[PDB]
RNA sequence: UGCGAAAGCAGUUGAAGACAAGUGGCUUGUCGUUCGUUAAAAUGGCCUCGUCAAACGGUGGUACAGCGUGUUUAAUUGACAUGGGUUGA
């Protein structure tokens, strides 16, 4: 003898635009927070090491938020002009911020009162400041001087290397994630230059011609880097100096990018992109940078980031808008005498020769319609169908199980006016859908076959039959006009 | 087993080059080349050369001269390189190697001492094999394969000077013992009609097949298992099939004995010394769909009649499933003799043809299944009645009731008798849709319209109806719409077909509004008779009466 | 882009002349993706089939050349074919039901 | 070089007698009850209840010792009717069994070690009688016999003796019973009850046979109620009876569903009503205080007769047509399960089970195919209503007369089935009704059984009205050529008397398993492939060159084709290619073939063999017109387009059997089929009647229904092989019974399925101390 | 579970599609 | 029942004998009866083996639904003495 097969929920052929695993995962980022800033949020970085805090650069202050309360734990307000970039070191121990007066100031993180050193860079505004990702004691600052500088933070008087060569407004750095001698910089003339730092450094080894003025350049692999600027982003193989993908799925200019790897996700890698028209989108680097999910925000989105790869807790997607506000969407995560008497209940057979196992697994709880179909209470199963809190596929599957299994007539025999009105009042709603309407058709046909006299007596289901008639009239106009559209594009083959 | 049949030195280049094929010449001084231009210098020429190759550089070229050795040339720059003689007898077929791939000092006389591709690099003396009349070089693991007229096969590998295998191959005087297309075999042609494939790793025959017809200049192509062959006194270069990623279409091999058939690509016009015309322009051998085209090397058809399962005590046949008979007494000799009994002086009568056919095939004269018949036999008796004699009432009624009529049906509109024409509409089991659409749109306004729309719907796919009913005028389709609106199911879907196949824009308006009104009332009557088909206690006080 | 929000604000306009010359002024290289969006929306929401198929009949009428010159009509707008096939397949059943 | 053999076993073949209810289970336990001795129609299987394996198989056709008893091409009424555990020849010394057959041979056979090459058989001096059963007690032996008005049988009891001349058994003739309707014998074999039909109605009589301890009789109107005489005939028809080991009580199970325990000393009755359809089997325990019953629900109940308390066992994959306690303490129940979802064959599962936890210790079954028609005096069992799975109380006689007349007179005598071979592990997959029996034939035992549709197949024992519902039929299943996926096609049928009762559903499902697990997983299903209400006439798996053997090609009766293939990106089996024509004629004479290269497809629709390519999936075309013949109109609708190798292809149609080459593009050979296979198979079944190889030929297969001095119920099979485009009949074999399916396993053999399901194949000091210690310590 | 017990039918997470999604050429 | 396609297209439904009831016959009805024809109901329904809670992975439509996490492409842990007694309607 077997166990009883479970009642299989009636699944129809799948409709278009189903819920992909990528968009289910990215759709459980919810409970949005909107924090109004004093000015447009230009940059946002995350702590790498305990990857659980993030710094938001508004105008003339940098606020570190926590990734468990989403309130400002700490804030950095002693800048003279607009602070532009603020990033954490790879050890997460200190925080660099480039400022509109060309004064890079690096504090230590989680202590806003101890400014550790103030590199006086160019007289022009310094727009991007980030530490090396391999090395710890070098900091790369590009400014509106069309020259980036590598500074050793011990010798903070002269820059240890001066990467010039770009004709207009260098706004982005990036480091290549396995070769630590390799700095890719990006400017408003297009032309991602990139430099070997053992060489002279006043000339790039090559240049990648993004045609639009680039807004950001990040590095995905040790080999391929992604530059956004203009309406698209392009990806570039770096061992072969050559473009290989470009996605232009926006309306306005892509402002920023960042990238995730190895995190707990159906997507093994994810590049998300923020694009001055409200949209932030996530692209999957493994199937050809195809877009998988997106968010629309209440204004032009200027910068975005996500929690880093090892977040281990409450996971965040943050987007700072040009409107001057900040949007966070997170996904969350008896007696010693009595115990000495009941000691052994946690042993589970380690030193024991034979280990027997016949405890059956406890299956899912049966719903009332399923146990009534099991107990052969077929009219009670119909009654349990037409309760209000039932799913539409559950009402459909108990109708289909009574149709295939036994008898519609058995399920409908002892009824009268007051006990048929649930069925017909659901058949009004079920006649609209394609997946239900065959079952609704034969159930209504059987109930008017064997209750044609109650039709005469009760007037308060006559009107239900009339409403059902106008419903089938609307549906038959729809099923006729669908055949007309089917013919009118059969003509166009 | 042929291919697409038409067209009655660096071995991997093409055109846009200068001359990557510099070769010797019959009855000339030594050698030449041409372009579609590289210089023709000397590789120490004026000897008894029979072929010429290069070191795959075209400025390290040579003249492979019958003097036991060869030197280098300067066909681009002017600076020669040095050489060193090994033998002094016959090195007319010298083939210089790549960077240490396949080279040995074999000239003509069993002295295959191994060396390298250099002027002073040497190796072992692998002259152990006997006097070989067919020494080739392949890339199994680059190897000299010797076939000897002392007859015996041997295979040495010039990778470590290692004799891989060898046996006794009794090869006679050959025509072309060319290595295979994947190199794993040896295609050796016998003189007139045969080409055998032998296993060139073990020196044994693997498939000794015959060929189609006379062919002399045969060589394996850059294919899977296919060869090309030109006729002896013919410019016909046919192809046969007994590289697999994105194969070749031209510039495969240059070995032919036609009218100076040098440098044989597909478009083989601009030759290296000849300046000839060109031919076919196909690719190499595909998988299996081109062998339905090249269905050659077998032309042995006979008259195939239906045999029977052999009677080994067939008297215990145990309740045969026929009506009354058991087996039809087959008379194929009488089938052939009925042709002589029919092709006679019954030039307008059915006394010596129709009675002859219905006596040779004792049927109900409108029915199949008492078959014993051949399509060539039915075609020849149909030819004999399409000659001097449709006025027979039995023969040309019982044989459009036969599924092998073979395309002599085109005059079925061109002759017009009512009962024979309707029977050829209903039952003739191969009909051209061109004539069917012409008969459909040459309307006589009758029930044969329904009988022709039936067959045109029930044996042709809808798009093959549409593409070949584009081939109509507009008066035909306007009168067709007018006749449908005047005065059924298959013609409704035929009307759907004509509306799909007339096109998009080029219509008129009054006919369109008339058809719109007609089909509006048609859908209304279809809806109402579909509705018709889908349409097929005690009071408290009474007063009644009873018997007194 | 793939902007469902302002796609909804553009096709909640249901004046017939506005829809007509809107699709007339539309570029014919993206009438196929407008038709894909309409097909998926009427597949999901079934009460939209009334208002939204006014859009899909105008896209076929106006761009009657582009998507007859496209080589794979059914493969490119499969979702429309599947939606209309499942809408019109059950027409004999509710014919018998309303009879 | 080809030889025919029968290698794999058949059906279990219990007592196929009427008028014996209860004990029709001829299988025995040993006395040291460690091995279970069941007969088959081909052999004696001896399973072992500890390890569930077969440990010894006494094949009948292996030797002339008892294949001389039956190897006939016409006569299989010689049947094996009882097995006894002792030795009837010499007493007091047992590891060997004495089998009594239904004619009178008594064979003594050793099942421990090798079978002896000369058994101890005898032949008892018997009249025209035909051996109902034998009976054992302490020492003595009885036998019972059947006879020649109203069609009833007549029984006669003898006693045996042996001793004086050791060739004959002498008989004694205790008594007779001159009209018997139904009979049963108690568990100890000490007494037996039966019914009489002696006038106004029938009668019931119990008699002890090994002594004149008791013999009583009474008309059963004193058993029956007063309500039943004004009710239907099911309320008074009796389909079961049983007695206990004392003869104090007796269970009468009626066709209405009730059971009634009468107390034989005073004829007071007690009614037990649970069975909602007919009661088919009853048994008592040894002490008589528990009653096992089984019926049309697949639920074995056991009634605690003290408190009238049922214990159930509900989903037993077959209706219980016999149940009985078995052990000395009653620790096993043996059951016969009739498995009546297929109406074309009576396929019984033998299932004992230990009574402790009610788990199926040693379930036994033969192969279960479903033939296209009913086979040979097959009667679906009795019930309350006349359904499509049973027959009512009236129509058994008319149904067997009609079935005999249908096998005699009629014309469509095709009962052929589709069997598949899993190309990985060489076990064969009989698609049962809404399920598959995976069964390996190198030990002829079932691997497992799996439901592949969504019916009420397992959840419910259907009863009197509900037996007019059928679960969906699996009509096609094919494996992909690497054995990684199983394609199956099923027809889902609707229940009657509603609006959607006349439109079927057609479901094509795709199943996967790794090479370890025994059961498949549904990865995808497409309901209505090819469109609504249109069938699939033929599915064809694809060769190893299209999508690495992961494509299927399904054909309509419109001539439409759909190519489905599994791609890993969208991790599902999706619809790749399509060629639909829209005709107005339909025909299910559709066949399909593929080139091994994966280039061109031969679509053998009716009267027409189209040639499609694969790249554009339309009809084949070369612009050079090198006699590109891409259609072959033949004289009748074609039913096999089997291409042996890439050169040529064999077409088989209902008149002729042609062969067509493509490297020489014309007909090469032809044969005549119409005198053999005329209008006898349904159009689409020659594909399962003939098959091929991949190198070494092609197999045709015809059937001759034998004749008297009119056709009869007897058949013979003529199978023939050809090598290399119909050249030589190098195999001409004849098999003694109807043949139903033939197919090539993937290592140059062809398996075939007999109509009684025998799978056959056509192939190519210290020593005495040791002995006495192993004696005395065992 | 028992060795004579048949395997029940279970769809699980099988993708049910129709015969009319021509999403592939 | 036969031919079919899943639609449909042709064919129907006799005789003997016995028994039961009702009023030796007559009527009606049955048949663990035969020959010929291709031919709704006896109050009578499906076992225990452990539940509950919280996750996670795919699948459909994220609160909704469903399958699984014993090995699987993937994905699980934890509570409880799984008793007896008295009220508990």
Cα D538 versus chain centre, distance: 25
Kindly provide the resolution of this structure in angstroms, with one decimal: 4.1
For chain B, give me the number of helices (H) and strands (E)? 11, 16
SS3 letters across chain C: CCCHHHHHHHCCCCCHHHHHHHHHHCCCCCHHHHHHHHHHHHHHCHHHHHHHHHHHHHHHHHCCCHHHHCCCHHHHCHHHHHHHHHHHCCHHHHHHHHC
- Range D403-406, long-range pairs (CB < 8 A, 24+ positions): D403/D374, D403/D377, D403/D378, D403/D379, D404/D377, D404/D713, D406/D374
Chain D CB contacts of A405 below 8 Å: 456, 459-460
Tokens 């018709």 sit at which residue?
Answer: B532
User: DSSP secondary-structure letter at D267?
Assistant: T
First to last CA, chain A: 56
Residues 6+ apart with CB under 8 A from A185: A142, A148, A163, A166, A170, A172, A173, A174, A192, A193, A194, A195, A217
Query: Would you call B346 helix, strand, or coil by DSSP?
Result: coil
CA distance B322 to B319: 9
- Strand extents, DSSP E, D441-504: 445-451, 473-479, 485-492
Asked whether A204 and A217 are in contact (CB, 8 A), the reply is no
Q: Which long-range contacts (C-beta less than 8 Å, at least 24 apart) are formed by A226-229?
A: A226/A257, A226/A259, A226/A271, A227/A186, A227/A192, A228/A254, A228/A255, A228/A256, A228/A257, A228/A273, A229/A186, A229/A190, A229/A253, A229/A254
* Rg of the Cα atoms in chain B: 38
The 10 Å Cβ neighbour count of residue D212 is: 10
Tokens of D273: 């009503």
- The H or E element that residue A131 is part of is strand A126-131
Do C60 and A492 count as a contact with CB atoms less than 8 A apart? yes
Burial class (CB in 10 A: 0-12, 13-18, 19+), A209: exposed
Which chains pack against D, by 3+ Cβ pairs within 8 A?
A, B, C, E
The two beta strands, D521-527 and E15-18, are parallel
When CB atoms are compared, the residue of C72, C75, C85 closest to E20 is C85
The alpha helices in B441-488, defined as continuous H runs, are 448-458, 462-469, 475-486
For the beta sheet containing D96-101, the strands, ordered from the edge strand earlier in sequence to the opposite edge, are D80-84, D96-101, D105-110, D122-123
d(C-alpha D167, C-alpha B296), whole Å: 76
| Residue C61 phi, psi dihedral angles, 5° rounding | -70, -45
Residue A139 makes CB contacts below 8 A (sequence gap 6+) with: A96, A104, A106, A119, A129, A130, A131, A132, A150, A151, A153
Contacts of D211 (CB under 8 A, 6+ apart): none
Q: Is D90 helix (H, G, I), strand (E, B) or coil?
A: coil
Pick out residues 14-43 of chain D having their CB under 7 A from any atom of nucleic acid strand F: none
Q: Count H helices and E strands in chain E, helices first.
A: 0, 1
- Residues 365-384 on chain A lying near strand F, CB distance under 7 A: 365, 367, 374-376, 378
Per-residue CA distances from D308 to D169, D199, D285, D304, D331 (Å): 46, 35, 15, 5, 21
Name B323's Cβ contacts closer than 8 Å, sequence gap at least 6.
none
The C-alpha atoms of residue A395 and residue A387 are separated, in whole angstroms, by: 9
Confirm if A99 and A118 have CB atoms less than 8 A apart.
Answer: no
The protein footprint on chain F, as nucleotides within 7 A of a CB, is: 1-7, 19-20, 30-35, 37-47, 49-53, 55-62, 64-70, 72-74, 80-82
F73 closest protein residue (CA to C1'): D571
D733 within 8 A of D6, measured Cβ to Cβ: no
Distance, in Å, from the CA atom of B28 to the CA atom of D104, rounded to the nearest integer, reads 104
Which chain A residues touch B463 with a CB distance below 8 Å?
A: 493
Contact B496 A493 (CB under 8 A): no
The DSSP call for residue D234 is G
* Identity of the residue in A291, A445, A478 whose CB atom sits nearest the CB atom of C87: A478
- In whole angstroms, give the CA distance from residue D109 to residue D120: 7
Which two structure tokens, joined as six digits, stand for A279? 């949209």
Q: Are B186 and B198 in contact (CB under 8 A)?
A: yes
Cβ of D312 near strand F (under 7 Å)? The reply is yes
Cβ neighbours for D40, distance < 8 A, ≥ 6 positions apart: D9, D10, D11, D12, D13, D366
Alpha carbons D131 and D15: distance in angstroms, whole number: 11
Q: How far apart are CA D554 and CA B221, in angstroms?
A: 39
Q: How many CB pairs under 8 A join A and D?
A: 46
Q: Which own/partner pairs from B332-340 qualify as long-range (CB within 8 Å, at least 24 positions apart)?
A: B332/B303, B332/B305, B332/B372, B332/B374, B334/B360, B335/B360, B335/B372, B335/B373, B335/B374, B335/B377, B336/B377, B338/B381, B339/B377, B339/B380, B339/B381, B339/B384
List the structure tokens of B381.
């008796």
Whether there are 3 or more C-beta pairs closer than 8 Å between B and E is no
Give, in degrees to the nearest 5, the angle at Cα A417 between A462 and A458. Answer: 40
| CA nearest to B251, candidates B61, B106, B36 | B36
Report the residue of chain A nearest B527, measured CA to CA: A480
**Which residues make Cβ contacts (< 8 Å) with residue A392, sequence separation at least 6?**
A430, A433, A436
Is C98's Cβ below 8 Å from some Cβ in D? no
What single-letter DSSP state applies at residue D214?
-
Residues of D in contact with B294 (CB under 8 A): 626
Cβ atoms of A214 and A237 closer than 8 Å: no
Whether residue A1 and residue D465 make contact (CB cut-off 8 A), yes or no, is no
Mutating which of C74, C75, C89 best tests the D interface, going by the most D Cβ atoms within 10 A?
C89
**Which strands make up the sheet holding D43-48, listed edge to edge?**
D28-29, D35-39, D43-48, D54-59
Q: What is the DSSP letter of B202?
A: T
Asked whether residue D679's C-beta has any atom of DNA/RNA strand F within 7 A, the reply is: yes
Q: Which nucleotide is closest, CA of D310 to its C1'?
A: F47
CA distance D551 to E15: 17
Instruction: Give B303: exposed, middle or buried? Use CB within 10 Å, 0-12, 13-18, 19+.
Output: exposed
CA torsion through residues B392, B397, B398, B401, sign: positive
Experimental method, per PDB record: cryo-EM
Q: Which of residues 402-461 of A touch strand F (CB under 7 A)?
A: 406, 410
Contact at 8 Å (CB) between A205 and A196?
yes
For A255-302, give the DSSP string.
Answer: -EEEEEESSSSSSSEEEEEE-SSSEEEEEETTTTTEEEEEEE-SS-EE
- Residue B144: burial class (beta carbons within 10 Å; 0-12, 13-18, 19+): buried
* Token representation of residue D292: 């096992």
- DSSP per-residue letters across B128-184: -S--EEEEEEETTTTEEEEEETTTEEEEEETTTTEEEEEE-----S-S-EEEPSSSS
Output the DSSP codes for D486-528.
Answer: EEEEEEEPPPSSSGGGG--EEEEEEEE--SS-SS-EEEEEEES
Nearest nucleotide (CA of A362 to C1'): F50
**Of D320, D324, D175, residue with least CA distance to D242:** D324
Give me the long-range contacts of D616-625 (CB less than 8 A, separation at least 24): D617/D561, D617/D563, D617/D577, D617/D578, D617/D579, D618/D579, D620/B289, D620/B292, D622/B292, D622/B293, D624/B4, D624/B293
**How many helices (DSSP H) and strands (DSSP E) are in chain A?**
10, 28
Q: Are A281 and A21 in contact (CB under 8 A)?
A: no
Q: Which residues pair with D651 in a beta bridge?
A: D658
Q: Are A127 and A98 in contact (CB under 8 A)?
A: yes
List the structure tokens of B433.
């849709």
- Are E22 and C74 spatial neighbours (Cβ–Cβ below 8 Å)? yes
**What's the half-sphere exposure (Cβ side, CA atoms, 13 Å) at D602?**
27
Q: Do D670 and B306 touch (CB under 8 A)?
A: yes
Are D283 and D241 within 8 A, CB to CB? no
Close Cβ partners of B26 (under 8 Å, ≥ 6 residues apart): none
- Residue D325 CB neighbour total at 10 angstroms: 20
Nucleotide closest in space to D406 (CA vs C1'): F38
H/E stretch holding A402 reads helix A392-405
Across all strands, nucleotide nearest D234 (CA–C1')? F42
Q: How far is Cα D442 from Cα D444, in angstroms, rounded to an integer?
A: 6
| Distance in Å, residue D497 CA to nucleotide F47 C1' | 35
Query: Residues of A with CB below 8 A from C88's CB?
Result: 479-480, 482-483, 486
- Per the listing, tokens 């008796």 go with B381
Q: How far is Cα B283 from Cα B143, in angstroms, rounded to an integer?
A: 28
* CB-CB contact of C30 with A458 (8 Å): no
* Residue A367 burial by Cβ neighbours in a 10 Å radius (0-12, 13-18, 19+): middle
**Nucleic strand F under 7 Å from the C-beta of D256:** yes
Measure CA A135 to chain center. 32
Instruction: Give whole-number Cα distances, D291 to B84, D238, D284, D302, D349, in Å.
Output: 109, 17, 5, 5, 22
- The token pair at D112 is 């421990």
Contact (Cβ atoms closer than 8 angstroms) between residue D225 and residue D167: no
- Proximity of residue D554 CB to strand F below 7 A: no
Cα separation, D678 vs D412, whole angstroms = 9
In angstroms, the CA of D394 and the C1' of F31 are apart by 8
CA distance D6 to D441: 11
> Could you tell me if C81 lies within 8 Å of chain E, comparing CB atoms?
yes
| B524 close contact with C: CB closer than 8 A | no
Q: Residue A117 in contact with residue A101, Cβ under 8 Å?
A: no
D178 touches strand F (CB under 7 A): no
Query: Whose CA is closest to D141, among D182, D174, D109, D165?
Result: D174
The H or E element that residue A384 is part of is helix A378-385
Question: Quick one: residue A191, left, alpha or beta (phi over 0 = left, psi -120 to 50 = alpha)?
Answer: left
Beta-bridge partners for A281: A273, A294
Closest residue of chain D to C74, computed from CA coordinates: D578
Residues in C closer than 8 angstroms to E20, CB to CB, are 81-82, 85-86
Which residues numbered 45-64 in C keep a CB inside 8 Å of some CB on B?
64
Asked if residue B377 lies in contact with residue B336, where contact means CB atoms within 8 angstroms, the answer is yes
Chain C touches chain B, with at least 3 Cβ pairs below 8 Å, answer yes
Return all residues near A143 (Cβ < 8 A) that are at least 6 apart. Answer: A98, A102, A121, A122, A124, A125, A126, A127, A149, A170
Do the Cβ atoms of D378 and D424 come closer than 8 Å? no
Given a contact cutoff of 8 angstroms between Cβ atoms, the answer to whether B50 and B87 are in contact is no
Angle between helix A462-490 and A421-430 (nearest 10)? 20
């Amino acid at each position: 003898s077997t166990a009883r097969p479970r009642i299989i929920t009636s699944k129809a052929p799948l409709l278009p635009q189903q819920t992909t695993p990528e968009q289910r995962y990215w759709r459980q980022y919810t409970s949005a927070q909107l924090v109004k800033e004093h000015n447009s949020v230009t940059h946002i970085s995350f702590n790498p090491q305990h990857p659980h805090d993030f710094a938001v650069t508004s105008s003339t202050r940098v606020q570190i938020f926590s990734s468990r309360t989403r309130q400002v734990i700490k804030t950095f307000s002693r800048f003279k002009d607009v602070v532009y970039s603020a990033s954490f070191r790879s050890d997460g121990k200190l925080l660099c911020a480039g400022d509109a007066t060309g004064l890079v100031s690096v504090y230590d993180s989680y202590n806003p009162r101890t400014i550790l050193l103030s590199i006086n860079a160019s007289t022009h505004p310094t727009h991007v400041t980030k530490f090396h990702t391999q090395d710890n004691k070098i900091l790369a600052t590009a400014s509106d001087d069309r020259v980036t500088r590598l500074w050793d933070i011990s010798n903070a008087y002269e820059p240890q290397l001066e990467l010039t060569g770009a004709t207009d407004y260098v706004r982005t750095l990036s480091f290549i994630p396995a070769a630590p001698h390799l700095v890719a910089t990006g400017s408003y003339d297009g032309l991602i230059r990139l430099y070997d730092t053992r060489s002279s450094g006043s000339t790039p080894i090559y240049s990648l011609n993004h045609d639009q003025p680039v807004e950001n350049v990040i590095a995905v692999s040790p080999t391929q880097i992604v530059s956004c600027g203009g309406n698209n982003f392009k990806v570039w193989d770096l061992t072969s100096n050559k473009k290989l993908y470009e996605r232009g799925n926006f309306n306005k200019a892509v402002t920023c990018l960042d990238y995730v790897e190895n995190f707990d996700s159906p997507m093994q890698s994810a590049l998300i992109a923020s694009s001055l028209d409200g949209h932030v989108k996530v692209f999957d680097p493994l199937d050809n940078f195809q877009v998988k999910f997106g968010w629309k925000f209440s204004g032009p989105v200027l910068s975005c980031a996500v929690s880093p790869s090892t977040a281990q807790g409450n996971r965040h997607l943050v987007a700072g808008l040009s409107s001057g506000l900040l949007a966070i969407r997170t996904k969350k995560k008896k007696s010693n005498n009595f115990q000495r008497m009941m000691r052994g209940s946690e042993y589970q057979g380690d030193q024991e020769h034979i280990i027997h196992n016949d405890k059956v697994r406890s299956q899912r709880r049966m719903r009332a319609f399923e146990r009534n179909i099991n107990q052969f209470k077929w009219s009670e199963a119909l009654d349990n169908a037409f309760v209000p809190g039932m799913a539409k596929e559950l009402t459909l599957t108990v109708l289909q199980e009574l149709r295939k299994r036994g008898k519609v007539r058995v399920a409908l025999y002892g009824r009268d006016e007051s006990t048929l009105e649930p069925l017909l009042n659901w058949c009004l709603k079920g006649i609209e859908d394609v997946r239900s309407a065959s079952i609704v058709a034969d159930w209504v046909a059987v109930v008017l076959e064997l209750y044609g006299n109650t039709l005469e007596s009760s007037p308060v289901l006559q009107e239900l039959m009339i409403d059902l008639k106008t419903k089938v009239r609307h549906e038959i106009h729809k099923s006729k006009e669908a055949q007309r559209i089917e013919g009118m594009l059969q003509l166009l083959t | 087993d042929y291919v697409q049949v038409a067209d009655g030195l660096m071995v991997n280049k093409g055109n846009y080059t200068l001359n990557v094929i510099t070769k010797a010449l019959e009855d000339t001084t030594d050698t030449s080349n041409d372009h579609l231009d590289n210089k023709a210098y000397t590789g120490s020429d004026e000897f008894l050369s029979q072929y010429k190759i290069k070191a795959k550089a075209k400025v390290m070229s040579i003249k492979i001269d019958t003097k036991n050795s060869l030197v280098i040339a300067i066909l681009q720059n002017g600076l020669i390189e040095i050489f060193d003689f090994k033998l002094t007898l016959l090195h007319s077929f010298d083939i210089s190697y790549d960077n240490l791939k396949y080279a040995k000092w074999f000239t003509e006389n069993g002295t295959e001492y191994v060396f390298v591709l250099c002027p002073l690099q040497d190796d072992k003396v692998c002259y152990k094999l006997l006097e070989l009349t067919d020494c080739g070089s392949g890339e199994s693991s680059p190897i000299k394969e010797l076939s000897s007229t002392i007859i015996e096969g041997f295979s040495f590998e010039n990778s470590k000077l290692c004799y891989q295998f060898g046996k006794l191959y009794k090869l006679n005087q050959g025509k072309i013992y060319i290595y295979s297309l994947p190199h794993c075999q040896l295609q050796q042609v016998i003189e007139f009609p045969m080409v055998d494939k032998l296993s060139p790793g073990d020196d044994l025959i693997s498939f000794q097949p015959v060929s189609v017809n006379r062919v002399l200049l045969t060589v394996n192509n850059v294919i899977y298992l296919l060869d090309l062959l030109h006729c002896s006194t013919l410019s016909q270069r046919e192809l046969t099939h007994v590289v697999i990623n994105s194969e070749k279409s031209h510039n495969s091999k240059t070995i032919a004995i036609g009218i100076s058939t040098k440098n044989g690509p597909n478009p083989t016009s601009s030759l290296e010394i000849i300046n000839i015309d060109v031919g076919t322009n196909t690719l190499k051998d595909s998988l299996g769909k081109s062998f339905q085209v090249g269905n050659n090397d077998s032309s042995v058809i006979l008259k195939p009649l239906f045999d029977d399962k052999d009677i080994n005590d067939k008297r215990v046949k145990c309740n045969d499933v026929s009506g009354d008979s058991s087996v039809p007494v087959l008379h194929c000799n009488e089938v052939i003799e009925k042709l002589s009994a029919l092709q006679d002086n019954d030039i307008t009568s059915f006394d010596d043809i129709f009675f002859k056919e219905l006596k040779i095939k004792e049927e109900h004269y409108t029915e199949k299944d008492r078959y014993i018949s051949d399509p060539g036999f039915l075609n020849k008796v149909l030819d004999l009645i399409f000659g001097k004699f449709p006025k027979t009432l039995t023969f040309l009624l019982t044989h459009p009731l036969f599924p092998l009529s073979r395309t002599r049906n085109l005059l079925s509109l061109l002759r017009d008798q009512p009962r024979l024409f309707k029977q050829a509409i209903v039952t003739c089991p191969n009909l051209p849709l061109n004539e069917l659409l012409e008969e459909l749109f040459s309307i006589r306004n009758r029930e044969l319209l329904l009988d022709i729309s039936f067959r045109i719907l029930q044996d042709f796919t809808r798009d093959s109806i549409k593409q070949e009913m584009k081939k109509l005028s507009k008066l035909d389709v306007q009168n067709f719409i007018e006749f449908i609106t005047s005065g059924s199911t298959q013609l409704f879907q035929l009307l759907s077909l004509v509306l799909d196949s007339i096109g998009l824009f080029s219509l008129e308006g009054a006919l369109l509004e008339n058809l719109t009104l007609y089909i509006d009332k048609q859908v209304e009557i279809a809806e109402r008779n579909t509705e018709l088909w889908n349409l097929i206690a005690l009071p408290t006080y009474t007063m009644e009466y009873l018997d007194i | 882009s793939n902007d469902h929000s302002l796609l909804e604000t553009v096709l909640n306009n249901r004046d017939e002349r506005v829809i007509r010359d809107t699709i007339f002024r539309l570029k014919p290289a993206l009438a196929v993706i407008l038709l894909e969006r309409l097909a998926e929306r009427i597949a999901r929401q079934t009460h939209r089939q009334g208002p939204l198929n006014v859009w899909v009949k105008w896209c076929l009428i106006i761009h009657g050349g582009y998507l007859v010159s496209i080589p794979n009509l059914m493969s490119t707008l499969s979702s429309l074919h599947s939606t209309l096939k499942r809408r019109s397949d059950l027409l004999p059943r509710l014919l018998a039901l309303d009879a | 070089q080809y030889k025919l053999s029968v290698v794999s076993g058949g059906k279990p073949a219990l007592n196929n007698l009427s008028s014996v209810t209860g004990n029709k289970n001829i299988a025995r336990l040993s006395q040291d009850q460690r091995n279970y001795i069941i007969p088959f129609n081909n052999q004696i299987k001896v399973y072992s209840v500890e390890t569930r394996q077969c440990v010894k198989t006494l094949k009948f056709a292996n030797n002339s010792l008892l294949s001389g008893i039956f190897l006939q091409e016409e006569e299989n009424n010689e049947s094996i009717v009882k097995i006894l555990l002792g030795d009837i020849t010499v007493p007091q010394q047992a590891h060997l069994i004495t089998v009594f057959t239904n004619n009178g041979h008594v064979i003594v056979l050793n099942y421990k070690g090798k079978l002896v090459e000369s058994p101890k058989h005898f032949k008892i001096s018997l009249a025209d009688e035909k051996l109902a059963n034998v009976f054992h007690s302490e020492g003595n032996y009885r036998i019972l016999t059947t006879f020649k008005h109203n069609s009833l049988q007549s029984y006669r009891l003898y006693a045996l003796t042996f001793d004086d001349a050791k060739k004959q058994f002498e008989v004694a003739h205790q008594a007779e019973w001159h009209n018997v309707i139904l009979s049963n014998i108690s568990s100890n074999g000490k007494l037996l009850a039966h019914m009489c039909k002696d006038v106004e109605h029938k009668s019931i009589s119990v008699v002890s046979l090994f002594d004149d301890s008791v013999n009583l009789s009474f008309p059963l109107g004193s058993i029956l109620s007063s309500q039943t005489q004004s009710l239907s005939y099911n309320t008074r028809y009796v389909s079961s009876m049983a007695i206990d080991n004392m003869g104090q009580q007796l269970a009468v199970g009626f066709a209405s569903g009730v059971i009634s325990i009468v107390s034989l000393a005073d004829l007071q009755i007690r009614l037990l009503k649970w069975h909602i359809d007919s009661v088919l089997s009853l048994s008592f325990s040894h002490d008589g205080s528990y009653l096992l019953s089984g019926g049309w629900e697949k639920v074995m109940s056991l009634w605690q007769l003290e408190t009238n308390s049922q214990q159930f066992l509900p989903r037993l994959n077959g209706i219980i047509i016999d149940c009985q306690v078995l052990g000395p303490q009653g620790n096993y129940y043996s059951l016969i399960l009739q498995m009546t979802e297929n109406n074309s064959n009576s396929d019984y599962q033998f299932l004992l089970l230990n009574a402790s936890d009610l788990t199926s210790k040693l379930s036994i079954n033969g192969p279960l195919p479903v033939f296209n028609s009913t086979i040979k005096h097959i009667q679906q069992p009795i019930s309350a209503m006349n359904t499509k799975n049973s027959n009512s109380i009236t129509s058994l006689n008319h149904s067997k007369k009609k079935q005999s007349r249908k096998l005699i007179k009629s014309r469509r005598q095709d009962f052929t089935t589709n069997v598949e071979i899993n190309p990985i592990n060489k076990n064969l997959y009989f698609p049962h009704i809404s399920a598959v029996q995976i069964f390996d034939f190198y030990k002829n035992e079932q691997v497992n059984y799996q439901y592949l549709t969504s019916g009420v197949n397992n959840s419910m024992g259907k009863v009197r009205f509900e037996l007019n519902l059928q679960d969906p039929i699996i009509t096609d299943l094919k494996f992909t050529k690497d054995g990684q996926w199983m394609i199956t096609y099923e027809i889902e049928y609707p229940p009657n008397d509603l609006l959607s009762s006349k439109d079927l559903t057609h479901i094509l499902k795709f199943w996967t398993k790794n090479d370890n697990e025994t059961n498949w997983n549904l990865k995808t299903k497409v309901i209505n492939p090819h469109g609504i209400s249109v069938p699939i006439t033929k599915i064809l798996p694809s060769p190893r060159s299209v999508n690495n053997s992961q494509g299927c090609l399904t054909a309509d009766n419109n001539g439409g084709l759909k190519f489905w293939s599994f791609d890993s990106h969208e991790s599902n089996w999706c619809l790749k290619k399509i060629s639909l024509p829209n005709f107005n004629h339909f025909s299910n004479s559709v066949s399909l073939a593929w080139s091994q290269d994966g280039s061109l497809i031969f679509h053998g629709f009716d009267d027409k063999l189209q040639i499609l390519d694969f790249d554009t999936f339309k009809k084949f075309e070369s612009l050079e017109n090198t006699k590109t013949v891409s259609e072959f109109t033949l004289d009748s609708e074609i039913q096999t387009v089997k291409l042996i190798n890439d050169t040529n292809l064999i077409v088989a149609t209902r008149t002729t059997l042609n062969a067509i080459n493509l490297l020489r593009g014309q007909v090469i050979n032809s044969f005549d089929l119409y005198p053999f296979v005329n209008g006898v198979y349904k159009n689409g079944h020659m594909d399962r009647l003939i098959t091929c190889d991949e190198r070494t030929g092609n197999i045709a297969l015809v059937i001759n229904q034998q004749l008297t001095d009119v056709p009869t119920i007897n058949y013979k099979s003529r199978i023939i092989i050809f090598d290399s485009d119909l050249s030589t009949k190098l195999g001409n074999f004849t098999h003694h019974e109807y043949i139903s399916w033939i197919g090539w396993n993937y290592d140059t053999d062809f398996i075939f399925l007999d109509i009684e399901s025998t799978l056959g194949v056509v192939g190519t000091n210290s020593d005495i101390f040791a002995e006495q210690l192993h004696k005395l310590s065992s | 579970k028992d060795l004579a017990s048949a395997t029940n039918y279970v769809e699980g997470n099988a993708r049910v599609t129709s015969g009319d999604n021509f999403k592939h050429v």
